[PDB]
Amino acid sequence: DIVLTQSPATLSVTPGDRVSLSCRASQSVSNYLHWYQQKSHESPRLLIKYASQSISGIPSRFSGSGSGTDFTLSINSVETEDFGMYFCQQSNSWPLTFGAGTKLELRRADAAPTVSIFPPSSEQLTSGGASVVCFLNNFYPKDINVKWKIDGSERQNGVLNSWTDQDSKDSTYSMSSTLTLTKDEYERHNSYTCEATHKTSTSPIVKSFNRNE
Amino acid sequence: QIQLQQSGPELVKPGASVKISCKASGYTFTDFYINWMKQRPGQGLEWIGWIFPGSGNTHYNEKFKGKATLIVDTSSSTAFMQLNSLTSEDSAVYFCTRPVSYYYDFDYWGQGTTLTVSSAKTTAPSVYPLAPVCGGSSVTLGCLVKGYFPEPVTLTWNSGSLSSGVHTFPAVLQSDLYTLSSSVTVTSSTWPSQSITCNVAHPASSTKVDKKIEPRGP
Amino acid sequence: DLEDNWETLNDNLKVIEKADNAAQVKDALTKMRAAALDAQKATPPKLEDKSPDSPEMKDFRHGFDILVGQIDDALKLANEGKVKEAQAAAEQLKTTRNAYIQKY
């Protein structure tokens, strides 16, 4: 089966700038390669067919080039409405295959996250549960590491993360990390620590509490 | 006037089967290949197979040749995909689509059908206030919405009047229930001198919850 | 002769692509159908001393089962005088060809 590699996974640009999205086939697909835009989970929108043939109605800023293995989708002067996902698809041979996608996003200055830790609510403890919540707020770019430690020891399981979409106002990302325990397990430890590692610093941003304060 | 119109969302139990419909209109249904695709949120599409509705001839991706079965009712101009032995790995958006051609201006896509494969039943959320630790210039408060099904819930602060410095995190599936959280940041002068409340609505369990955030302490 | 059957399939796909009318399309597809069923009967060079029931031999023949079924769907369209519909159907034939032409 033919593999389509889209590099980079994320492309940060300012409106008005040129941009090029790469799609490389693991074997020859001739010009049997098509480009789609998808804003959300709605049906994909065909931009370019047969590598460089533009679709009726697609604005002039879009063009595709390449044949064989190396393809490029070009946007001459990026518009706000161009931010979203881009997929390449080959129709050279069965099975039909797609790239994993390139995300086109608004560029801005790198920013360290604001970290806040929250012990389980008294209401939740009463019901027999214990969630420890860590918010990592208003950072850029999107990639971030959260490390949970319990009595100073890294905890892998019980942790679930969720990133927001790029903020409409400041173009930053935020992330929730929730560690879910039993009230039993919660009360068998004293120290809870959430550690944020982000490219803006080698040193991590630590927030901790003692269960008994 | 050329459309492909798929059936609405499906909630199905592990082990069960489902039949998604694709209603063609504004062209001769029997004359054009119909492709079926699978997409998990934010992920690359996968091709399932095609059917030529004129003949009922089909071809499958090896990956889906035991999972999906394509048929047509040529009277109603409807393509159907049967998914069998369903697990949570089959949870996805499914699209029917007339493929790109050198000979036609456009391709055509159904709006998509969301399939949820879960044993979960409708469940009201637990809502918890997240106050800061016992013991700065700015203060971040939180709202934890835990153990609900299905999607969605809506969350506001002070009934939408507090919209600045708010982040509402997309829901995640933990052990066949959904967890969602929200943060709001205000100046220390603002809280706790003024009341801040998260307002959670879960229409499917007919639930509304208001949780005022109160200082923790002795 | 297996090589020449592939080339007949390849040659008639160019004719369908350039075709003005339904007659040109129909005549091409009919020749393609015959070339594909003759090819099925052959054994490609790499599998010369394999079993006739080898997973590779079945697949080789299976490629032509797919092609014939696609030629049939296009022949139905071309028999109704539908040139563009047939040309789009013949498009899906190329994808099958490319997947099996040099696999063996």
Residue numbers in the entry:
A (entry chain L): 1 to 213
B (entry chain H): 1 to 135, 139 to 221
C (entry chain X): 2 to 105
Which passages does the manuscript contain on this structure?
BRIL, an engineered four-helix bundle protein, is a thermo­stabilized apocytochrome b 562 protein from Escherichia coli that is derived from cytochrome b 562 and stabilized as an apoprotein without the cofactor heme by introducing M7W/H102I/R106L mutations. Structural flexibility can be reduced and thermostability can be improved by replacing the flexible loop of GPCRs with BRIL, which is often necessary for expression and crystallization. We recently reported an anti-BRIL antibody fragment (SRP2070Fab) that facilitates and enhances the crystallization of BRIL-fused GPCRs and demonstrated that SRP2070Fab can be a versatile crystallization chaperone for BRIL-fused GPCRs. In this study, we characterized the high-resolution crystal structure of the BRIL–SRP2070Fab complex, which provides a clearer understanding of the BRIL recognition sites and the crystal-packing interactions.
A complete data set at 2.1 Å resolution was obtained from the BRIL–SRP2070Fab co-crystal, which belonged to space group C2 with unit-cell parameters a = 93.83, b = 75.24, c = 152.23 Å, β = 99.67° and contained two BRIL–SRP2070Fab complexes in the asymmetric unit. The overall structure of the co-crystal showed that SRP2070Fab binds to BRIL by recognizing conformational epitopes, not linear epitopes, of the natively structured BRIL. All six complementarity-determining regions (CDRs) in the heavy (H) and light (L) chains cooperatively enable the recognition of BRIL, and CDR1 and CDR3 of the H chain that pinch helix IV of BRIL from both sides are remarkable compared with the others. The BSA on antigen–antibody complex formation is 923.2 Å2 on average for the two BRIL–SRP2070Fab complexes in the asymmetric unit, which is larger than the average for known antigen–antibody interfaces of 534 ± 157 Å. Hydrophilic interactions such as hydrogen bonds and salt bridges play major roles in BRIL recognition: seven hydrogen bonds and one salt bridge are formed between the H chain and BRIL. The crystal packing of the BRIL–SRP2070Fab co-complex is largely due to SRP2070Fab rather than to BRIL; that is, SRP2070Fab contributes almost 80% of the BSA due to crystal packing. The results of the crystal-packing analysis showed that several BRIL–SRP2070Fab complexes stack against each other along the c axis in a face-to-face or back-to-back manner, while the complex molecules are ordered by side-by-side contacts within the ab plane. Face-to-face stacking is predominant among all of the crystal contacts contributed by SRP2070Fab.
